[model samples]
Target: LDSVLPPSLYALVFTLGLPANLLALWAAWLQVRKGRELGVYLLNLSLSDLLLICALPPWTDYYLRRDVWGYGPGACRLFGFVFYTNLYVGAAFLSCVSADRYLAVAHPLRFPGARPIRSAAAVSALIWMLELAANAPPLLGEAIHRDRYNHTFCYESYPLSGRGAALANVGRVLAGFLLPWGVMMLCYAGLLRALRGSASCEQRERRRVRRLALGLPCVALLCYGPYHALLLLRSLVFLVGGCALEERLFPAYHASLALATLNCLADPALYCLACPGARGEVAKVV
Candidate 1:
């Protein structure tokens, strides 16, 4: 089940996510050139997705070979580093995008000096640096291991035994997923409320903004919520229960990890290309 399920999903994500993110990158670049602050977030989001997509092919190959990691431990760590780093980075940038939209709608004139494209760029840089620092510990240790059957596995060393692992999992779940999700929801709520009170907004414009404010948070929840829930649950089980329960939960947890990759495809299509200026840029290229 692990062999077929994850690899198939990884392959699909790599195939579709690559081109979509590439197009989003181009469109976002053009928008940024035109001095649109939102584009800065979109551009960074696409870059994060592209980085994660680049790390997928080896994972697909690893899973297809029945969890056998042909690559050395260093390669495994590198790919895993890229994979996990961008996962949280994607969430962070998505939150930034939501906050950007919310501010654009709710307090359009507030903090004008602090909301420049350069500020977004600095935020993106900070996120990348922080995520890299957080995920770097994996590189300091061996991620490759052999099963009882002598099959080599990369990053399959589960049953997170140490207090360090459990604490890290809790921290990651809270900081990476839950915090970003809460921020996004709050921003969306504020945006919707502001939109509702705007008498100057055209009906069509109001409806469009309403849909975007509602849809983006829904997509974020749908894509990332399950995986993080399972991750937290898995860690809890490890701390409270035995390996038997952990083993039983592994399949669902692994599947949820695959499902989480769907955000790679969703971000570009829903957030970047959905914008009018981005769509115009994409149309020009097409």
Candidate 2:
């Protein structure tokens, strides 16, 4: 059997995915456009979610039928652009959130109160540069492939043609999973220690930091980790045998993909949870 899926199921995915991301986009706009020590990292995270959510419905339609793209090379490349940008930007967003909390808690004296507009601008620009650096690979030479089944996949993958896929996939594992998760944990841990120990107006912002600290990274692990793991597995299998023995994995892969899609939806909740005005809505009794 080929790797393609039915069309109707994709419709269900688009339905589940779009609403959550749209709400999150609304929330992110409110948070970043305002200011909440959100810094630039947070805004980029919002942007990543917004873009990813926007892209998912089209992909769902494409993969469900394995249709040959009517879109020309430019449009196809545009798809690759959005895809790569959002993926890297999403990781950067989480990294920035954890880093923001860590920096704030670690250097409270320097940035004791809310973020000034100028500093926020500087941070945002820095984040943009970082995202661009990581995401430009696909556009450089990462070709898109379409097979007899009519399925099209785009990757600036060194593995398929240029170089070793295993090496490339390992880089993804480090960038997408290990490094970000470790940094996030470290920042949140340090923030908690400072919050409980410092006992000052830092406590005011502590709740916001805590929400991003505890919530987003955990969701990051949940939403994206499996996909990466399955990806590595797929890569390894392809590197060895050309056949698809792991038919069972396709569902798990789809599930993780959906979970990643849902992250866009959940992001707005994060915005309200991060911002000050929504304190009443965001505060947890527990």
lDDT of each: 0.82, 0.61
Tens-digit lDDT string for candidate 1 (1-286): 4558888888889999999899999998887887888888888899999998998888887766766677664568788888888889999999998888788878877844654977888888999899999988756555556645646766655657566667777788999999888999999999888888777889898888878888888988898988888878777666664567766876787688788899999999997667787788778888
TM-score of each: 0.93, 0.72
Residue-by-residue lDDT tens digits, candidate 2, 1-286: 4335433444444565455445444545555566655644555676676676566656665565444554455466666668656765676667767777687778878873554656766766776776567656656645666555755544433224523634555567677667778887888888877777655656567786676678777887786777778777766665662334444665566555655555555655565544565454233211
Query: What RMSD value applies to candidate 1?
Result: 1.9
Give candidate 1's error at residue 281 in angstroms: 1.6
Stretches > 4 Å off in candidate 2:
1-35, 67-74, 112-120, 140-142, 146-148, 154-159, 162-166, 198-212, 236-242, 245-251, 273-276, 279-286
**lDDT (Cα) of model 2:** 0.61
Count of backbone clashes, every candidate in sequence: 0, 5
